[PDB]
Design a protein around this ligand. Structure first.
Ligand SMILES: Cc1cc2nc3c(=O)[nH]c(=O)nc-3n(C[C@H](O)[C@H](O)[C@H](O)COP(=O)(O)OP(=O)(O)OC[C@H]3O[C@@H](n4cnc5c(N)ncnc54)[C@H](O)[C@@H]3O)c2cc1C
Ligand SMILES: Cc1cc2nc3c(=O)[nH]c(=O)nc-3n(C[C@H](O)[C@H](O)[C@H](O)COP(=O)(O)OP(=O)(O)OC[C@H]3O[C@@H](n4cnc5c(N)ncnc54)[C@H](O)[C@@H]3O)c2cc1C
Lengths: 488, 488
């Protein structure tokens, strides 16, 4: 009763491909199932956030892009602020369309050994005490039934594993309707191009000389709550419904309607069926928050579900994914709700824009909103030892020295392993506390480049800290039982 | 063609009485006209803000109250924060009903020489190039026509000088309806006493053992936009309309309905007719902001309009009242709108309460919101010389020393005069720059009690700074032309 794959990941979106890479990184047979025989080819989210730039640099993937310029001044709710006041913060990468991100993740995942299988469509699932058998419509055979120890739903907001798997997916009543298009045809000639006029609002930002990006929301009560694909009819007629400008003669690449519905499943784990990315949470899509949040979901999940399949799988793990990403989810839904109330709203939120504009004068508020939208630092995983200094917080880039070699530690998280940084001393804690050299990485160096921290840290494969130190009376090595196993 | 009074102030509300005191302080015949033959006797706004405690202490009036305890932890939009992080800030006085405030202001104004005249009702006005003739219905004669150089409207939100004087009074469409009562009769037994349930919300705070304060707003679209007095019928039936609790058997002192309409006149001066207090601006009434804002209006206006009538009335003055209080007005309307959106609102503003709760962790945000609601420090009068260090900002209490006498300077602003603080040196600037000893007050002392400022300041009668200094190349004495006259 052998398996086809330890993990069947559903959907070759950014979330699915990232997860496949993580799993495969830590030695896990993974088959990926995607409805589409070709990727969407759609430039949806221009760029991604800076916590995501770091997830990619953790694994050494930034080269695959080519041009990784970053925007220091971004916004919150439409109030532009400087992002570089947070050490390492930024508003994210500027010009990478979703197509390019999925392209390199597909390349990386098949390069690492995953079996991407396009044209397979999940139709059913059954979950037993030792496995999961899924029902996927191959191109060749009408059905084809697969078997794995785990199935992870990385399919869309209209998730399919969610419904048959039994996941409950509650959320917020919709209040605003937003429509997107890459309009390439008869161009627009806008003069009211950012105004909150009565009826709704229009925004336009160019991305090619041919193509312009139409953001188009209207001040109404929606009627078709599900965010779905539409023709140019609605976007053009509603545009003239607000502006009196006709843009009907143009030709779109694609147009879509979405609402500010925010939903999030109550459980990220239901037996052996999972949800990562937009399968787990949805919201009003802009800023690349969905792709960024899904890629970070998948990264947090990857190494956990990876060695869960092999040995060295402790008690708490694979329930720490829910425990660490569900609050993050119910928090980004709250913050995107907040931003768009304060941004899309009319004359009731004018005071809001004013007040926050005033609060952004202060840099404590700057850094607060910084970490809120970047997802770089407000993600401090509340699950830790005492949680006081930098525990569930991530570890930022810092150069290391010759005692190991020149190599700094961003390079260290690239194999999806863990790491432990010591000073060439603390020999007892260097090896009598760590003789798991294959299990994690033990590194010896005088790593103090800049001004902020001091010695005594080992970190998780996703870049989170698990053991803060100074010599604390006893050197606690049971944190390595908290996130790894007791093996010789 | 002699006058009855230099100023006819209309309305013996807090604003009118305060203004009468200021005018009369600086030597101005003032007659006050109030519709009511007896004051309202209503405990409306429990306490007042701390900029108002300072206005009263400027004139040495805090004794007339008796019990001046102050609350250090207040709120913004329902988020409680510590107010004492601002030097001198607080959430204001706790237990003073509006009745007690009007009582002592009436006592002070008639003690200083004003002629309070109850039972006189303004019915008309006519404004000529040299005077104003008003039409007031005395108790004795049916009409009685009065004449003064100026008329100041310190009557209510349903102002009467506003309409005939021709003032344009635009503002915000109403969104929420709020109702107040001092319910003294069959008491309520509340268990859902602060919840934002669907339909609206209920709040109750006790003020006597008999009487409790019913705040009662409902989540609807109002129909009678004008804020007016009502019977207990509506408050009781709407209460059960939200809670299913019947409080109909009780007996109120008074009940009133109000909306979140915020209005503000475009001009505070229209010829020789004025608006101070709720005659100039209105909003959703809670927190004592209306009485506090009106009392500060009246204080800013008082000494200006006072010596405007006598000689020594410069060019810019009596247009600086509009120039200095209209932005303050259009700002408090914005901030009360903001608070109550974030407080009274339902599930759309939940993220709002969350975000500000997070931002209040930071004390820069604390002090910002501090100064916003206290009106103690965000009122920095933008009209000044360069406006850079503490110009249009007010001057806080600080002890002075024996070179004058023990007396510190809160005592100095009590005669409604100006003042100038020097160190016993700078003799040339002490008297060759200031030989207006009667016009302003020249004080000599080593005033450095605590840590914050250094020497070189003269201040306006309302407590605002007009001449910052250090020795600046030249000692500019033309600021004394900016707010006083050139007289020997
Ligand atoms: C048209 C459009 C425009 C967008 N524009 C923006 C934007 O401008 N800014 C922004 O921030 N966000 C935007 N978004 C949202 C953002 O693109 C998504 O959040 C992002 O793609 C993350 O999705 P994911 O990683 O969960 O996978 P998704 O991209 O949601 O893809 C899910 C994958 O699962 C596959 N799948 C679905 N059903 C099945 C099935 N039964 N069997 C097998 N495979 C299946 C799908 O075909 C797809 O390959 C946009 C989304 C869309 C659709
Ligand atoms: C019932 C009630 C409850 C309130 N509760 C609160 C509360 O809980 N918290 C809060 O912060 N604020 C509250 N307010 C608002 C606050 O009391 C007012 O903003 C405050 O009184 C400031 O008004 P004012 O100083 O401009 O004069 P007002 O108090 O408005 O009085 C105006 C005066 O002008 C007189 N007048 C009117 N028309 C004429 C005329 N034609 N001729 C002559 N005189 C005239 C009136 O009779 C009155 O004496 C309440 C107001 C009311 C009415």
């Amino acid at each position: 009763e052998f398996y086809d794959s330890d993990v069947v990941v559903v959907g070759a979106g950014p979330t699915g491909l990232m997860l496949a890479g993580e799993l495969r990184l830590a030695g896990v047979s993974v088959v990926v199932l995607d409805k589409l025989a070709e990727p969407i080819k759609e430039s949806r989210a221009l760029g991604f956030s800076a916590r995501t730039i770091e997830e990619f640099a953790q694994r050494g993937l930034m080269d695959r892009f080519g041009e990784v310029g970053v925007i220091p001044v971004g916004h919150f709710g439409g109030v532009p602020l400087d992002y570089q006041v947070i050490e390492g913060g930024s508003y994210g990468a500027r010009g990478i369309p979703q197509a390019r991100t999925e392209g390199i993740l597909g390349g990386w995942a098949r390069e690492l050994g995953a079996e991407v299988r396009r044209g397979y469509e999940v139709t059913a699932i059954e979950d037993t005490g030792t496995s999961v058998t899924v029902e996927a419509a191959g191109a060749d055979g009408s059905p084809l039934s697969l078997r794995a120890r785990y199935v992870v739903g990385c399919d869309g907001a209209r998730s399919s594993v969610r419904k048959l798997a039994g996941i409950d997916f509650p959320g917020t009543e919709p209040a605003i309707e937003l429509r997107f298009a890459d309009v390439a045809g008869v161009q627009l000639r806008p003069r009211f191009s950012g105004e909150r006029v009565p009826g709704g609002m229009v925004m336009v930002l160019p991305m090619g000389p041919d193509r312009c990006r139409v953001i188009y929301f209207d001040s109404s009560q929606p009627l078709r709550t599900a965010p779905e694909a539409i023709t140019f009819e609605e976007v053009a007629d509603s545009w003239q419904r607000l502006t009196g400008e006709d843009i009907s003669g143009a030709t779109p690449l694609w147009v879509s309607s979405a609402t500010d519905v925010s939903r999030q499943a109550a459980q990220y784990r239901k037996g052996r069926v999972f949800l990562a990315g937009d399968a787990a949470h949805i919201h009003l899509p802009i800023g690349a928050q969905g792709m960024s949040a899904g890629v970070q979901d998948a990264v947090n999940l990857g190494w956990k579900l990876a060695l869960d399949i092999s040995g060295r799988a402790p008690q708490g793990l694979l329930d720490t994914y829910h425990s660490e990403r569900h609050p993050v989810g119910q928090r980004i839904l709250t913050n995107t709700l907040a931003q768009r109330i304060l941004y899309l709203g009319g004359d009731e939120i004018t005071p809001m824009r004013e007040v926050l504009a005033e609060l952004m004068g202060s840099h404590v508020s700057v850094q607060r909103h910084l970490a809120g939208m970047v997802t770089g630092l407000d993600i401090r995983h509340d699950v830790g030892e005492g949680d006081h200094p930098l525990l569930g917080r991530r570890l930022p880039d810092r150069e290391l020295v010759v005692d190991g070699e020149k190599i700094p530690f961003y390079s260290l998280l690239r194999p999806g392993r863990a790491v432990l940084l010591e000073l060439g001393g603390d020999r007892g804690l260097r090896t009598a506390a760590a003789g798991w050299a294959d299990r994690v990485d033990l590194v010896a160096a005088e790593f103090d480049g800049c001004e902020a921290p001091v010695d005594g840290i080992l970190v998780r494969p996703d870049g989170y800290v698990a053991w803060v130190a100074a010599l604390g009376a006893d050197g606690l090595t049971t944190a390595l039982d908290r996130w790894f196993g007791p093996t010789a």
